[PDB]
Amino acid sequence: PVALHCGKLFDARSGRVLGPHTVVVRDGRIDQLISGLAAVDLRNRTCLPGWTDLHVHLGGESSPQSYSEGFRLDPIDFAYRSVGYAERTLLAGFTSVRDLGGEVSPHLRDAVNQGLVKGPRIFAAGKS
Amino acid sequence: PVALHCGKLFDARSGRVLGPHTVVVRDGRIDQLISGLAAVDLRNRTCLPGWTDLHVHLGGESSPQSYSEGFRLDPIDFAYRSVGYAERTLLAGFTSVRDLGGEVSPHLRDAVNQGLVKGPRIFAAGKS
C-alpha cells in the first residue's frame, strides 16, 4: 500500500497530459485516482504507464563474434547474459515485452515470474 | 633426354660448391656427371638438388577466418585451395614435402602422382 504523488499524469487513452494526481496501489492494482499510508514524492515528474516493446530478443545480442559463438557456446551462457539484458531492459522503463524468437526466453520468463531474477513481463514465442 | 650445362654445382654430400658440370637425364634419373641431345643453358647459375620440406600442411592456410570456416566449409573447397598451394610450393624449388596432418593431402598426393595437378612429391601422414 503506497500513495503516489506526481505533478503531471499522461492519460494514455486520451493522449493528453493532465495535472496533479494521487495514485493508490494495494494488492498490485490501481485502486484510486484522486485528482487535485506510504508516500512517494514525484511532484516534479510526469506520470506514465509502463512501456511495452513488442519486438525483442532477450536471449542474445549482436557482436562481431555472433556468427561463431553458436558452435562453441551453450544456452546456459546465453541465459547468464540474458540476466543482465533483462535487468537493463526493465530499468529503462519497459515493464513488458513480446519476445519473437529464441529458446532461452520461455525459461527467463519462468525465472522472472518466480522472482529469481529481475525483468519485465515476458510474452515469449519460442522457436520461430 | 636433356643435357644440363650449369656453371657451379653444389655437392650435397660434401657441402662444397664445385665448378662447371654437365648432367645428362634420361628416363627421369641422373645418368652422367661429366665434369669440365636437348640442351638447357644454365652456365650463369648454381646447380642444386631439389629441396625437401619435412613439415608442411598443404590442406589449408592460416587466416583471420580459420576458426569459423570449419563449421561452414567442406574438404572440397580446401582441395581447390590446395591446388594453388601445391603449385606455389613446387615453383619455389621444393620438389618433395612431408605432410604432417590433414585428410586432404593423401588425395592431393594421388592427384599429383596421376598428373592431374602440379605439385611436389608428397609423403602424407593422414590424420594425426
Extract the annotated binding site of A for Zn(2+): 55, 57
Query: Which of these, A46, A58, A71, lies nearest to A99 by C-alpha position?
Result: A58
Residue B9 burial class via C-beta count within 10 angstroms: exposed 0-12, middle 13-18, buried 19 and up: buried
Chain B residues within 8 A of A68 when measuring between CB atoms: 67-68, 71
The dihedrals phi and psi of A52, each to the nearest 5 degrees, come to -120, 125
Q: Which DSSP letter does residue B117 get?
A: S
Amino acid at A128: S
Three-state DSSP at A12 gives coil
Angstrom CA distances, B30 to A6, A30, A122, B33, B52, stand at 101, 101, 81, 8, 18
- Experimental technique: cryo-EM
Q: Which DSSP letter does residue B43 get?
A: E
What the block records as the C-alpha cell of B69 is 570456416
Q: Which DSSP letter does residue B28 get?
A: T
- Hey, what's the torsion of the CAs at B83, B86, B88, B92, to 10 degrees? -160
**Shortest CA distance from B65: residue in chain A:** A68
What the block records as the C-alpha cell of B61 is 592456410
**Shortest CA distance from A68: residue in chain B:** B68
Chain A residues within 8 A of B71 when measuring between CB atoms: 68, 71
By the 8 A CB rule, do B93 and B120 touch? no
Cα-Cα end-to-end distance for chain B: 41
Amino acid at B77: D
**Structure resolution, Å:** 2.3
Pairwise CB contact (< 8 Å): B67 & A71: no
Rounded to the nearest angstrom, the minimum Cα separation between A72 and chain B is 10
Rg (CA), chain A: 19
Rounded to the nearest angstrom, the minimum Cα separation between A69 and chain B is 9
Q: Which residues of B93-116 are buried (b: 16+ CB within 10 A; e: fewer)?
A: ebeebebebbebbeebbebbeeee
Helices vs. strands in chain A: H and E counts, helices first? 2, 8
Amino acid at A72: R
By the 8 A CB rule, do A12 and A49 touch? yes
